[PDB]
């Protein structure tokens, strides 16, 4: 009924902040977001996890940083936690150079493909934009 | 108060 | 077990839409993670602190913005669960 | 609150994939929604209830086809939540 | 922290059961849906749902159906059940006779343009292909 | 056993 938090380590944290990108792209510097970055680390210390900020990466920079934790060994962790702070689309994530497919990053954390953390849960929490639409509110 | 491009 | 079995998803925003963040505190999302996360991982399940940011960023927070087709905007996160079971923190 | 807020898309299957029916008792995750509703609707959350269907078409289905290449395959669902509360059917 | 469930009904389950295609779409005969939409009536019901099975709808009909019980209060209701069951793509849902964007059946009961519906839950489950890949699954 | 088309 619920996954078992009783491994040895609670697990491993990624965060990936990016603000300033290349003229190339088009995209605007993401202020506040060491606040973001800042007040994550502390949240998930304060859970037991291990935390690792890493600032400004290109796309490809990104695809490396996720297949080399996909290829540590977590069986003595209980979750898998990734936290990505960027622009982004529909289904994409910007390195600072531009964009990349949410799916490649996390098709390295499947179960075929990741077994320390086959039967794990595994939580990508994404800050970014996926398209341009606009809420507008309702009276309450 | 920012957004996270313009389309 | 499916390959695509025991991920979680946990979007800023909507499908479709921008996302929104505040240049002195954060992203309203991020704000409201940590905040809920601080006052409820001890207590309450993954899906039910998540349902509580949910809430957090509909209620809490409105654009403020110089132009007139960005102000006085909302936001929702979207839970996206490929969970089979409830996680607990503890 | 965003126009968005307090919507619930319980997929039978993840983005991208077939979902899996059969022919004489119905589709996987139809078959297993009613069923946890039945056994939990009077104690469960909407999440975790979802959250059993889940785990239920994870485990217990698996495709018997005469083609090769459609044999022996998986589901998961994808639950989708907007919701700002918790929802209870009592 | 829970939705009002405390309302005179518990509101409105909508089943739309399509198992035969138009030649045009090219859509195989979906056999065991009438299992399906026999079991989610009796579920639905037990849950004091008031359940209404519509059968081998065009898309025009679905979209129909959709803007007319949009167009019904729910006032003296607790939340709003939609139930598809057909074929589909990734964010699409098929009538008898071809597609139809999943976002036009749901953008009917936002809160903007469903005022007694506004507050509340709204649930929609949806058996229906989103693409074409297959998952392969893992030993565990 | 069917899926719910053919690409």
């Known amino acids: ?140 | 108060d920012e957004v996270x491009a313009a389309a | 077990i499916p390959v695509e079995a025991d991920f979680l998803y946990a979007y800023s925003t909507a499908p479709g839409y921008y996302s929104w963040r505040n240049s002195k505190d954060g992203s309203w999302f991020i704000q409201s993670l940590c905040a809920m996360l601080k006052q409820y991982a001890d207590k309450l399940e993954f899906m039910h602190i998540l349902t509580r940011v949910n809430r957090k960023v509909a209620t809490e927070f409105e654009s403020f913005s110089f132009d007139a087709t960005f102000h006085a905007k909302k936001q929702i996160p979207c839970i996206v669960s490929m969970l089979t079971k409830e996680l607990y923190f503890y």
Do not use: W
Request: glycine share 8%; proline share 2%.
């Open chain 1, 1 to 140: 009924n619920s996954y078992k938090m009783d491994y040895p380590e609670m697990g491993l944290c990624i965060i990936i902040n990016n603000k300033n990108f290349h003229k190339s792209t088009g995209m605007t510097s993401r202020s506040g977001t060491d606040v973001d970055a800042a007040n994550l680390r502390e949240t998930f210390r304060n859970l037991k996890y291990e935390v690792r900020n890493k600032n400004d990466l290109t796309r490809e920079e990104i695809v490396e940083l996720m297949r080399d934790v996909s290829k540590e060994d977590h069986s003595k962790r209980s979750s898998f936690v990734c936290v990505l702070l960027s622009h982004g689309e529909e289904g994409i994530i910007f390195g600072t150079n531009g964009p990349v497919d949410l799916k490649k990053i996390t098709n390295f954390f499947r179960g075929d493909r990741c077994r320390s953390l086959t039967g794990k849960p595994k939580l990508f929490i994404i800050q970014a934009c996926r398209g341009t639409e606009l809420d507008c509110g309702i009276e309450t």
